[PDB]
Amino acid sequence: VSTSTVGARRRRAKQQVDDEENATLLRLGPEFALKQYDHDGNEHDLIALSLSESRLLIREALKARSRARNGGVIDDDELAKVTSGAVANGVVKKTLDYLNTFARFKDEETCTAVDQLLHLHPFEIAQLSSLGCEDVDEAITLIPSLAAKKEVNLQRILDELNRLEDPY
Amino acid sequence: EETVEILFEAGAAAELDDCRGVSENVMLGQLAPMGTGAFDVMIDEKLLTSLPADYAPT
Amino acid sequence: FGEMERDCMIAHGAAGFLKERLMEASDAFRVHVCGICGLMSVIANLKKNQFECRSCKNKTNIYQLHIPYAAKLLFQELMAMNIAPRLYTERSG
Amino acid sequence: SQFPYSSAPLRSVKEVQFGLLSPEEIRAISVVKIEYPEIMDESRQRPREGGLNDPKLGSIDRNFKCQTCGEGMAECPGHFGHMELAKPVFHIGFIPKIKKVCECICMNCGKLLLDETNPTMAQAIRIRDPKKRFNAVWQLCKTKMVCEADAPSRGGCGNTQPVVRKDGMKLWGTWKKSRDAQPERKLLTPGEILNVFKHISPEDCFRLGFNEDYARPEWMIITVLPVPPPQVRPSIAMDETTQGQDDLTHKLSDILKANINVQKLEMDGSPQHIINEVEQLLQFHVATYMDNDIAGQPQALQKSGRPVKAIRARLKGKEGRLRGNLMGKRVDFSARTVISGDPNLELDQVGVPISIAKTLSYPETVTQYNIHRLTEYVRNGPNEHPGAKYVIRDNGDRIDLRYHKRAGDIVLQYGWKVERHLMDDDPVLFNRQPSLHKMSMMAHRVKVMPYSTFRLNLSVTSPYNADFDGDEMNLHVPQSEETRAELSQLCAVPLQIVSPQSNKPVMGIVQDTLCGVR
Amino acid sequence: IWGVKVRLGKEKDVVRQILKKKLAREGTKNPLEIYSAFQRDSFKGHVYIEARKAEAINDALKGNVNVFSNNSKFLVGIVEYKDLLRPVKLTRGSYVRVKNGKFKGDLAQVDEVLENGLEARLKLVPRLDYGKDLSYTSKFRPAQRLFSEAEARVHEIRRDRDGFVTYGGEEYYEGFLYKTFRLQNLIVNSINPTLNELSLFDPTLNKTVKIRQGGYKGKIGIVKEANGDRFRVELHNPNKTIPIPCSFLLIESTHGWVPYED
Amino acid sequence: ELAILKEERTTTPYLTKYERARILGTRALQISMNAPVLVDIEGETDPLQIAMKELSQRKIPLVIRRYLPDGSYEDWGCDELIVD
Amino acid sequence: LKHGTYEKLDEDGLIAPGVRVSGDDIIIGKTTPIPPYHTKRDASTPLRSTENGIVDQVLLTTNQEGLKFVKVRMRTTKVPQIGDKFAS
Amino acid sequence: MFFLKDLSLILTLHPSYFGPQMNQYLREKLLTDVEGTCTGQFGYIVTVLDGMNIDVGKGRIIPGSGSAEFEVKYRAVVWKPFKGEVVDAIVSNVSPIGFFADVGPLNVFVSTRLIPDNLVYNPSNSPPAYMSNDELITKGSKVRLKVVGTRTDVNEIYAIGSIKEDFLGAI
Amino acid sequence: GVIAAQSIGEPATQMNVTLGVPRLKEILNVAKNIK
DNA sequence: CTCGTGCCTGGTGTCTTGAATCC
DNA sequence: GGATTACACCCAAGACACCAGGCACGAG
RNA sequence: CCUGGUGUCUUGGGUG
Ligand SMILES: [Mg+2]
Ligand SMILES: [Zn+2]
Ligand SMILES: [Zn+2]
Ligand SMILES: [Zn+2]
């Protein structure tokens, strides 16, 4: 039905088992290669999004479109009624509410601070932001790929994440 | 001519047929790149905008 | 509609007319192909709306074609003699 | 439109990739294994599973749905089976190429007898065309009469190579054992050659002009036979309740019987000289199943005495699949009758008999501008002219107006189609055989007339090389809005007055009118 | 031992002919110097001949019209001799497939064998009609169904024992036919049970019409099609079928041509 | 990429007989499927006639994509091509 | 069964002389039984689709094998018209 | 796991829709057909970016049928989960065979043989929960699980989790 | 292309050096030994 | 009543030796 | 040693054999 | 109360 920029995938003599999606082994399949191409043929890094980025973009896109539907005229339950159809109403409401209960940095002030702090494979950089951690010991266990990289700063990463983190 | 021999030989040497000939497309029943089929026809979205607004798709 | 009548329509450049004569006005047939291996090996249940090329384990990259029935017949006779005619819908160079 | 809706995207064919079917792939697309030559269960209706008419292969009967795709016989393409061979046999089409490969490679390990160190040979691998490269290589290596273990180690085995000769369906290799001594030529069985071919390296596979993904060289030996569905070999009823089988059906039974007897040998009484007679016979049946015009040996015969119609003979010649059904074919919406002249018709008109005009039709789409006009045709029905034969809905269901007794209760919706009778000024393509040049096919405007001949204005007899001594001509009716416009704007008679053949007219004033005008 | 190719089906004849030649020449100055000859059914189209010199093989076959004239004889190895002469089941309670008669192809249980050892009593699902059309072949037989003695009682029978009836001179015990077959008439090897065995074990059309008004008044015809109001009469007089309104017709009935009161 | 800019178009500025026939037929077809017609329809109600009327007034809303041998192409609108 | 009319056959399965026939009308009714009621299959002969005329004469007899055997001769009259061919 | 993907959809347009607001109709048409749907190749398509400004290109007219074919290139927010990815969740159901957890659009099933023995299902408690002493798994409790297997139905995808490993569970 | 083929073939169908059809045949068949 | 012979149906399987030019 | 040898169309005129086994009928 | 299948392979004689 719907297709992408990546095409053909004609048969090759040697098979491959670096295709099976394994986040531990950095296998994201043929569609989510490290170097993608946009609809003009230009080269582009894979766009993986943390929970904090994603909350701003999706909410902005929905209210800008909602304003556009109103000729140019906050709460998650109100923002999800913009969609068309009960099937669409469901997936969008559940995604905001899920993000509403797990996004630490729920505003653009803190988020841009986290944005500048983080901006080396692009997938790992996005993983560190999504999974909250206390110490260096907790990060290399649950995410065993950070082992043999020999470039920490990790502690100051976690300290800034936890300091920017508002109380609850 | 040499109909079957061509096709056996074509198999054994994995020939690729790029379907640019008239005869290729005729026997596969597709519009051949000749005469009225030598070009594509596109819809002029720019010229449609000069029509009045009550003709609009909803 | 013999070989010599085919040539006359080419000379007139009436490509559209020639296509219709040899398909819609005769033995037009719809086949399904696998986007990976290019064979007519798709098993298509249209009321259940489920398609599968078992060889490629592929249920998503599948296309339909309009070809003459006598061409479909030709390819099955070629398959029976171990010749693989793979129909791809895109070029690559 | 005659096809039910399917969500799969519609595309056209841009490339045809030829190649060979691997043994593994044949099994992957097969839906059943074929073992028993008895077609019927026990002559008590319903054909035997695992037999040659196993219902999983498909339906050629209007009342049994396919047990694989669920579709009716019209849509169901048929699905292949497979037949395992007890012993690998040669493909009859590829023997002379197999023979060529033997002189190129080592008959022990299978490596190309020459390297890039040889200057002329290094030039030959650069040749871009696979066929010419393969021939250029073989032209060099032909005279190399020993596979060297050592470079001129290259991976060689040191053995001298035989001179392989073809003797019918058998290949004989004569090895020169190390002046002159005694050489012993033994038979090079398919199984022996099969194992040798699988050990050819990928790098030498490419250099031989073969292709690792599409035409791998051991696939020229047949180990499992694809069983075509019944659509390829339909049954026919000679005198209603008596049906004979297609030549392929009988021939597949013979291969299947012969296959069982090879299994019947290796487990008990094999006097060796019997194994060679039974294996060669399996090779024979598989060969004449594909090609029954093998030079130098008698043809396989039916019990009627006439030769078996092999697959190769199905495709060649004037009546075969290519010249008889694909480069040309029989077509709908055509008509033919004797022609007569009429001076009181315009140059671009053709007089069409009423009876022909009621049989042919054009599917005119219903719009706001003609809906009132088209309803009048519907009330008149198929037997009064000007009338109509069918009303086609957007779903495709046709209403046959011969049998619709409540014809007065039809209301037409926009977008439907009415197949109305042929009517005045419709363009049609007119044609006389033999079509020697492009003005053998010109578009004329219909004028419906009584009596059963086609009428031509006399000045068009010359380009058709027609006269009225018994000649017949053909009429073809375009079936859509796009082709009507193509006929009137490209093929119409007045556009054809001057021909590019000799930059001069091909029509003039003729016969009576020319005599009289002087 | 040499093998020789012979016309299919003529192997026994060639063995016979060789024996006659041998016996006829015994003790003469030109004896046939072969020891034996034989033909194995499993080895179609071959005869084997025992001798010391190849010339004796040619001598044995000279003039034999069943032998291929091509110099096709072949030598057998000593290590292959005994296998040429290898001579080669059936147990009560086991299944076999019948090879002859209306029960051809049917699965049957072996009930017992004759004392002499030739025919075996088989237990079979019957194919009967209960004498329904009496005043059989394998192509015009009946479906299989267990014998029903009450159906036989109703429709057409001798009781012999508990659950045993003789019906039309065949024996049925607990619904099964018990019938003797030659052992050579049953298949005991490589039987494949089937799926089925696993389950078991307008009133004026076409009437003649006269036309009473119009240009065709007085002509005979037949109503070919009567969709509504407009009829299709196949006129007799010219080879044409016309469209005509219903007011114009007279129909034939018991008494003359009657208007639209029929 | 393949598309050639408007200022650098090199193919002939006259409508060819083949382009004309395809344009008339395609536009005719669309009208019979009840596409909005861009000219006044008076007495001439045949699908082909309406399409021929639109052509004569330079009002057919279609673009010709003329393929060149290498695969590149120039898009020409039927509003700008000169019809004899 | 065939699509044409069976109403011109008499009870003996044969049409009688003097009856006009048109295309696809059945003139000889014959059945064949279906092997293993409602057991037979039609094997009847229709008049050629392009013809008409009058049944002129019907021969009934038996052949060398003893089964029944019929011939039906149809006559019509052809009147010259536009398109017919003539020669000195 | 969220990504931004540049996608495209082939749209066929009937000729009766050839009016001055054609593009705006197509923009509405794209959104109705794509938003909220799932595919095994990309995952759930959550929202499309910059919907009212998408450049649809030019439509190819299909020979012989009159209808027009647009290739609408676009950019969307997509959500696909992955095997090996550790994620948080909100439990939707608790049953004798494990629990079901809503991670945004879909639901993940964790079976009993991959749950530690000390977490005991307690129906008598009010409200029902998986309980310990300093642990509390009620509906809405943050839990940390790891996706160990993805199965594809091409309509909705199904992922199976596990809490049979270190540092996974309630927090 | 096709126009060229018909333009040359059609006159041939109605038609001491060799001329007419036998000479035409020598050309297309580019015979090494002409008559 | 039993045995033998003839006819019909079904199943399986081949073989005495006997038009001309061109590439 | 094969492959090449105009196009389309109409219509009338034809079809497995031999051997073995089983069943039925007639005669003794 | 809608759907609705009648053969093939040759050979020979003809038409332009
Ligand atoms: Mg003439
Ligand atoms: Zn595939
Ligand atoms: Zn099927
Ligand atoms: Zn070697």
Side-chain angles (χ1 to χ4, degrees), chain A residues 2-3 21 23 31-32 39 47 49 65 98 131, chain H residues 2 4-5 7-8 35 41 48 80 83 88:
Chain A
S2 191
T3 68
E21 300 178 343
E31 291 299 332
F32 300 92
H39 291 304
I47 310 298
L49 303 179
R65 178 189 311 173
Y98 169 82
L131 298 175
Chain H
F2 289 97
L4 286 187
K5 204 61 82 172
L7 300 180
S8 70
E35 278 190 329
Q41 186 184 3
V48 168
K80 178 172 179 177
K83 184 184 69 177
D88 296 329

PDB file of all heavy atoms in Angstrom, chain A residues 2-3 21 23 31-32 39 47 49 65 98 131, chain H residues 2 4-5 7-8 35 41 48 80 83 88:
ATOM      1  N   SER A   2       1.314   1.657   1.192  1.00  0.00           N
ATOM      2  CA  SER A   2       2.217   2.788   1.360  1.00  0.00           C
ATOM      3  C   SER A   2       3.665   2.310   1.324  1.00  0.00           C
ATOM      4  O   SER A   2       4.014   1.311   1.963  1.00  0.00           O
ATOM      5  CB  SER A   2       1.929   3.512   2.676  1.00  0.00           C
ATOM      6  OG  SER A   2       2.612   4.750   2.734  1.00  0.00           O
ATOM      7  N   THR A   3       4.510   3.032   0.585  1.00  0.00           N
ATOM      8  CA  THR A   3       5.897   2.643   0.355  1.00  0.00           C
ATOM      9  C   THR A   3       6.801   3.820   0.694  1.00  0.00           C
ATOM     10  O   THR A   3       6.336   4.909   1.045  1.00  0.00           O
ATOM     11  CB  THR A   3       6.150   2.204  -1.098  1.00  0.00           C
ATOM     12  OG1 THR A   3       6.022   3.335  -1.969  1.00  0.00           O
ATOM     13  CG2 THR A   3       5.197   1.090  -1.540  1.00  0.00           C
ATOM     14  N   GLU A  21      15.385  -7.309  13.778  1.00  0.00           N
ATOM     15  CA  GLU A  21      15.505  -6.144  14.643  1.00  0.00           C
ATOM     16  C   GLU A  21      15.881  -6.501  16.074  1.00  0.00           C
ATOM     17  O   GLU A  21      15.150  -7.193  16.790  1.00  0.00           O
ATOM     18  CB  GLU A  21      14.188  -5.383  14.587  1.00  0.00           C
ATOM     19  CG  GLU A  21      13.883  -4.931  13.166  1.00  0.00           C
ATOM     20  CD  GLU A  21      12.565  -4.209  13.048  1.00  0.00           C
ATOM     21  OE1 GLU A  21      11.748  -4.333  13.984  1.00  0.00           O
ATOM     22  OE2 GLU A  21      12.351  -3.521  12.026  1.00  0.00           O
ATOM     23  N   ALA A  23      17.621  -4.098  19.107  1.00  0.00           N
ATOM     24  CA  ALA A  23      18.173  -2.796  19.487  1.00  0.00           C
ATOM     25  C   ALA A  23      19.554  -2.925  20.120  1.00  0.00           C
ATOM     26  O   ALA A  23      20.356  -1.989  20.039  1.00  0.00           O
ATOM     27  CB  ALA A  23      17.219  -2.080  20.441  1.00  0.00           C
ATOM     28  N   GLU A  31      14.578  -0.514   6.426  1.00  0.00           N
ATOM     29  CA  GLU A  31      13.883   0.763   6.317  1.00  0.00           C
ATOM     30  C   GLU A  31      14.506   1.835   7.196  1.00  0.00           C
ATOM     31  O   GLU A  31      14.381   3.028   6.899  1.00  0.00           O
ATOM     32  CB  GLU A  31      12.407   0.573   6.648  1.00  0.00           C
ATOM     33  CG  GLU A  31      11.674  -0.241   5.590  1.00  0.00           C
ATOM     34  CD  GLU A  31      11.677   0.380   4.194  1.00  0.00           C
ATOM     35  OE1 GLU A  31      11.758   1.621   4.054  1.00  0.00           O
ATOM     36  OE2 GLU A  31      11.610  -0.396   3.216  1.00  0.00           O
ATOM     37  N   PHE A  32      15.158   1.425   8.279  1.00  0.00           N
ATOM     38  CA  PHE A  32      15.686   2.323   9.296  1.00  0.00           C
ATOM     39  C   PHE A  32      17.197   2.184   9.310  1.00  0.00           C
ATOM     40  O   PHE A  32      17.802   2.026  10.375  1.00  0.00           O
ATOM     41  CB  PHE A  32      15.141   1.987  10.690  1.00  0.00           C
ATOM     42  CG  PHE A  32      13.642   2.071  10.838  1.00  0.00           C
ATOM     43  CD1 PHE A  32      12.830   0.963  10.637  1.00  0.00           C
ATOM     44  CD2 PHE A  32      13.047   3.277  11.173  1.00  0.00           C
ATOM     45  CE1 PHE A  32      11.456   1.062  10.781  1.00  0.00           C
ATOM     46  CE2 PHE A  32      11.682   3.372  11.348  1.00  0.00           C
ATOM     47  CZ  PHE A  32      10.886   2.272  11.130  1.00  0.00           C
ATOM     48  N   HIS A  39      12.762  12.579   0.187  1.00  0.00           N
ATOM     49  CA  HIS A  39      12.080  12.554  -1.105  1.00  0.00           C
ATOM     50  C   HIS A  39      12.762  13.379  -2.221  1.00  0.00           C
ATOM     51  O   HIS A  39      12.144  13.512  -3.288  1.00  0.00           O
ATOM     52  CB  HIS A  39      10.647  13.026  -0.891  1.00  0.00           C
ATOM     53  CG  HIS A  39       9.812  12.063  -0.111  1.00  0.00           C
ATOM     54  ND1 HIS A  39       9.637  10.752  -0.498  1.00  0.00           N
ATOM     55  CD2 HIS A  39       9.109  12.210   1.038  1.00  0.00           C
ATOM     56  CE1 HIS A  39       8.862  10.135   0.376  1.00  0.00           C
ATOM     57  NE2 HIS A  39       8.523  11.000   1.318  1.00  0.00           N
ATOM     58  N   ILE A  47      16.411   9.618  11.926  1.00  0.00           N
ATOM     59  CA  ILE A  47      15.789  10.516  12.897  1.00  0.00           C
ATOM     60  C   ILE A  47      15.103   9.681  13.972  1.00  0.00           C
ATOM     61  O   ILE A  47      13.950   9.281  13.835  1.00  0.00           O
ATOM     62  CB  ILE A  47      14.826  11.490  12.226  1.00  0.00           C
ATOM     63  CG1 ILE A  47      15.522  12.151  11.041  1.00  0.00           C
ATOM     64  CG2 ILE A  47      14.364  12.540  13.209  1.00  0.00           C
ATOM     65  CD1 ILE A  47      16.737  12.966  11.455  1.00  0.00           C
ATOM     66  N   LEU A  49      13.765   9.760  17.877  1.00  0.00           N
ATOM     67  CA  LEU A  49      13.251  10.842  18.703  1.00  0.00           C
ATOM     68  C   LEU A  49      13.046  10.382  20.138  1.00  0.00           C
ATOM     69  O   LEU A  49      12.402   9.353  20.382  1.00  0.00           O
ATOM     70  CB  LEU A  49      11.937  11.393  18.159  1.00  0.00           C
ATOM     71  CG  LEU A  49      11.851  11.929  16.740  1.00  0.00           C
ATOM     72  CD1 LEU A  49      10.430  12.383  16.502  1.00  0.00           C
ATOM     73  CD2 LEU A  49      12.811  13.084  16.566  1.00  0.00           C
ATOM     74  N   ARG A  65      -2.575  22.469  13.173  1.00  0.00           N
ATOM     75  CA  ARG A  65      -3.579  21.962  12.246  1.00  0.00           C
ATOM     76  C   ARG A  65      -4.988  22.277  12.729  1.00  0.00           C
ATOM     77  O   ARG A  65      -5.857  22.623  11.919  1.00  0.00           O
ATOM     78  CB  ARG A  65      -3.351  20.473  11.983  1.00  0.00           C
ATOM     79  CG  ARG A  65      -4.367  19.818  11.068  1.00  0.00           C
ATOM     80  CD  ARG A  65      -4.162  18.328  11.068  1.00  0.00           C
ATOM     81  NE  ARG A  65      -2.747  18.052  10.848  1.00  0.00           N
ATOM     82  CZ  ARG A  65      -2.192  16.850  10.911  1.00  0.00           C
ATOM     83  NH1 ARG A  65      -2.936  15.792  11.183  1.00  0.00           N
ATOM     84  NH2 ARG A  65      -0.890  16.707  10.693  1.00  0.00           N
ATOM     85  N   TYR A  98      -0.003   8.390  27.401  1.00  0.00           N
ATOM     86  CA  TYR A  98       1.188   7.604  27.735  1.00  0.00           C
ATOM     87  C   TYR A  98       2.385   8.526  27.912  1.00  0.00           C
ATOM     88  O   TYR A  98       3.155   8.396  28.866  1.00  0.00           O
ATOM     89  CB  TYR A  98       1.470   6.536  26.680  1.00  0.00           C
ATOM     90  CG  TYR A  98       2.820   5.860  26.833  1.00  0.00           C
ATOM     91  CD1 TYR A  98       2.978   4.815  27.733  1.00  0.00           C
ATOM     92  CD2 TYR A  98       3.910   6.212  26.037  1.00  0.00           C
ATOM     93  CE1 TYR A  98       4.188   4.172  27.878  1.00  0.00           C
ATOM     94  CE2 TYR A  98       5.128   5.568  26.176  1.00  0.00           C
ATOM     95  CZ  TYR A  98       5.258   4.546  27.098  1.00  0.00           C
ATOM     96  OH  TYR A  98       6.459   3.898  27.248  1.00  0.00           O
ATOM     97  N   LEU A 131      15.638   6.491  28.425  1.00  0.00           N
ATOM     98  CA  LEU A 131      15.684   5.652  29.617  1.00  0.00           C
ATOM     99  C   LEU A 131      16.390   6.443  30.717  1.00  0.00           C
ATOM    100  O   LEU A 131      17.595   6.697  30.635  1.00  0.00           O
ATOM    101  CB  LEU A 131      16.401   4.329  29.338  1.00  0.00           C
ATOM    102  CG  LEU A 131      15.766   3.427  28.285  1.00  0.00           C
ATOM    103  CD1 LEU A 131      16.636   2.221  28.014  1.00  0.00           C
ATOM    104  CD2 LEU A 131      14.395   2.998  28.756  1.00  0.00           C
TER     105      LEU A 131
ATOM    106  N   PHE H   2      10.045   5.860  18.744  1.00  0.00           N
ATOM    107  CA  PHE H   2       9.578   6.856  17.788  1.00  0.00           C
ATOM    108  C   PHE H   2      10.636   7.255  16.770  1.00  0.00           C
ATOM    109  O   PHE H   2      11.816   7.408  17.103  1.00  0.00           O
ATOM    110  CB  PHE H   2       9.171   8.141  18.516  1.00  0.00           C
ATOM    111  CG  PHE H   2       7.916   8.042  19.330  1.00  0.00           C
ATOM    112  CD1 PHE H   2       7.982   7.805  20.693  1.00  0.00           C
ATOM    113  CD2 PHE H   2       6.675   8.246  18.749  1.00  0.00           C
ATOM    114  CE1 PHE H   2       6.832   7.739  21.463  1.00  0.00           C
ATOM    115  CE2 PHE H   2       5.515   8.190  19.512  1.00  0.00           C
ATOM    116  CZ  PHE H   2       5.598   7.937  20.875  1.00  0.00           C
ATOM    117  N   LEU H   4      11.004   9.721  12.850  1.00  0.00           N
ATOM    118  CA  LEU H   4      10.469  10.486  11.731  1.00  0.00           C
ATOM    119  C   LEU H   4      10.806   9.816  10.405  1.00  0.00           C
ATOM    120  O   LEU H   4      11.984   9.602  10.097  1.00  0.00           O
ATOM    121  CB  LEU H   4      11.009  11.915  11.745  1.00  0.00           C
ATOM    122  CG  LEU H   4      10.431  12.846  12.807  1.00  0.00           C
ATOM    123  CD1 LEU H   4      10.907  14.277  12.615  1.00  0.00           C
ATOM    124  CD2 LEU H   4       8.923  12.784  12.819  1.00  0.00           C
ATOM    125  N   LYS H   5       9.779   9.499   9.627  1.00  0.00           N
ATOM    126  CA  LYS H   5       9.922   8.811   8.351  1.00  0.00           C
ATOM    127  C   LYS H   5       9.296   9.594   7.212  1.00  0.00           C
ATOM    128  O   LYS H   5       8.185  10.119   7.325  1.00  0.00           O
ATOM    129  CB  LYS H   5       9.347   7.393   8.368  1.00  0.00           C
ATOM    130  CG  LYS H   5       9.999   6.507   7.306  1.00  0.00           C
ATOM    131  CD  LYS H   5      11.480   6.281   7.398  1.00  0.00           C
ATOM    132  CE  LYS H   5      11.827   5.208   8.372  1.00  0.00           C
ATOM    133  NZ  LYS H   5      13.276   4.872   8.289  1.00  0.00           N
ATOM    134  N   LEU H   7       7.630   9.206   3.920  1.00  0.00           N
ATOM    135  CA  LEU H   7       6.849   8.161   3.280  1.00  0.00           C
ATOM    136  C   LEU H   7       6.149   8.692   2.041  1.00  0.00           C
ATOM    137  O   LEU H   7       6.141   9.894   1.762  1.00  0.00           O
ATOM    138  CB  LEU H   7       5.805   7.590   4.244  1.00  0.00           C
ATOM    139  CG  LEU H   7       6.312   6.957   5.519  1.00  0.00           C
ATOM    140  CD1 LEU H   7       5.142   6.448   6.328  1.00  0.00           C
ATOM    141  CD2 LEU H   7       7.184   5.802   5.094  1.00  0.00           C
ATOM    142  N   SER H   8       5.505   7.771   1.326  1.00  0.00           N
ATOM    143  CA  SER H   8       4.704   8.182   0.190  1.00  0.00           C
ATOM    144  C   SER H   8       3.595   7.174  -0.046  1.00  0.00           C
ATOM    145  O   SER H   8       3.707   5.990   0.284  1.00  0.00           O
ATOM    146  CB  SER H   8       5.545   8.313  -1.082  1.00  0.00           C
ATOM    147  OG  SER H   8       5.956   7.043  -1.546  1.00  0.00           O
ATOM    148  N   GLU H  35      -3.481   8.070   8.985  1.00  0.00           N
ATOM    149  CA  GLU H  35      -3.339   8.338  10.415  1.00  0.00           C
ATOM    150  C   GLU H  35      -4.038   7.283  11.264  1.00  0.00           C
ATOM    151  O   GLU H  35      -5.230   7.012  11.089  1.00  0.00           O
ATOM    152  CB  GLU H  35      -3.919   9.707  10.759  1.00  0.00           C
ATOM    153  CG  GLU H  35      -3.011  10.891  10.507  1.00  0.00           C
ATOM    154  CD  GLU H  35      -3.580  12.168  11.104  1.00  0.00           C
ATOM    155  OE1 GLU H  35      -4.822  12.293  11.173  1.00  0.00           O
ATOM    156  OE2 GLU H  35      -2.785  13.042  11.512  1.00  0.00           O
ATOM    157  N   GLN H  41       6.046  -2.986   8.524  1.00  0.00           N
ATOM    158  CA  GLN H  41       7.284  -2.466   7.952  1.00  0.00           C
ATOM    159  C   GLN H  41       7.780  -1.221   8.686  1.00  0.00           C
ATOM    160  O   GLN H  41       8.989  -1.050   8.883  1.00  0.00           O
ATOM    161  CB  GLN H  41       7.062  -2.181   6.467  1.00  0.00           C
ATOM    162  CG  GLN H  41       8.287  -1.774   5.673  1.00  0.00           C
ATOM    163  CD  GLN H  41       7.939  -1.430   4.233  1.00  0.00           C
ATOM    164  OE1 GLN H  41       6.772  -1.448   3.846  1.00  0.00           O
ATOM    165  NE2 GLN H  41       8.949  -1.098   3.439  1.00  0.00           N
ATOM    166  N   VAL H  48       1.103  12.804  10.859  1.00  0.00           N
ATOM    167  CA  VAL H  48       1.852  13.256   9.694  1.00  0.00           C
ATOM    168  C   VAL H  48       2.260  14.711   9.904  1.00  0.00           C
ATOM    169  O   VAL H  48       1.443  15.539  10.320  1.00  0.00           O
ATOM    170  CB  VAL H  48       1.013  13.080   8.416  1.00  0.00           C
ATOM    171  CG1 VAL H  48       1.622  13.802   7.223  1.00  0.00           C
ATOM    172  CG2 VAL H  48       0.837  11.602   8.112  1.00  0.00           C
ATOM    173  N   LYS H  80       7.265   2.345  16.039  1.00  0.00           N
ATOM    174  CA  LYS H  80       7.452   0.917  15.951  1.00  0.00           C
ATOM    175  C   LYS H  80       8.250   0.454  17.165  1.00  0.00           C
ATOM    176  O   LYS H  80       9.282   1.065  17.492  1.00  0.00           O
ATOM    177  CB  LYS H  80       8.148   0.541  14.648  1.00  0.00           C
ATOM    178  CG  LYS H  80       8.435  -0.922  14.454  1.00  0.00           C
ATOM    179  CD  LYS H  80       8.950  -1.134  13.045  1.00  0.00           C
ATOM    180  CE  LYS H  80       9.293  -2.578  12.780  1.00  0.00           C
ATOM    181  NZ  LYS H  80       9.726  -2.778  11.371  1.00  0.00           N
ATOM    182  N   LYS H  83      12.430  -5.518  19.364  1.00  0.00           N
ATOM    183  CA  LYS H  83      12.997  -6.560  20.211  1.00  0.00           C
ATOM    184  C   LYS H  83      14.345  -6.137  20.779  1.00  0.00           C
ATOM    185  O   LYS H  83      15.238  -5.699  20.048  1.00  0.00           O
ATOM    186  CB  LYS H  83      13.117  -7.865  19.423  1.00  0.00           C
ATOM    187  CG  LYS H  83      13.610  -9.045  20.237  1.00  0.00           C
ATOM    188  CD  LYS H  83      13.786 -10.272  19.362  1.00  0.00           C
ATOM    189  CE  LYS H  83      14.939 -10.101  18.398  1.00  0.00           C
ATOM    190  NZ  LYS H  83      15.148 -11.328  17.588  1.00  0.00           N
ATOM    191  N   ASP H  88       9.169   1.340  29.541  1.00  0.00           N
ATOM    192  CA  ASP H  88       8.206   1.480  30.616  1.00  0.00           C
ATOM    193  C   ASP H  88       6.802   1.239  30.066  1.00  0.00           C
ATOM    194  O   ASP H  88       6.581   1.265  28.849  1.00  0.00           O
ATOM    195  CB  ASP H  88       8.332   2.869  31.229  1.00  0.00           C
ATOM    196  CG  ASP H  88       9.681   3.083  31.890  1.00  0.00           C
ATOM    197  OD1 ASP H  88      10.261   2.097  32.392  1.00  0.00           O
ATOM    198  OD2 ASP H  88      10.174   4.231  31.882  1.00  0.00           O
TER     199      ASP H  88
END
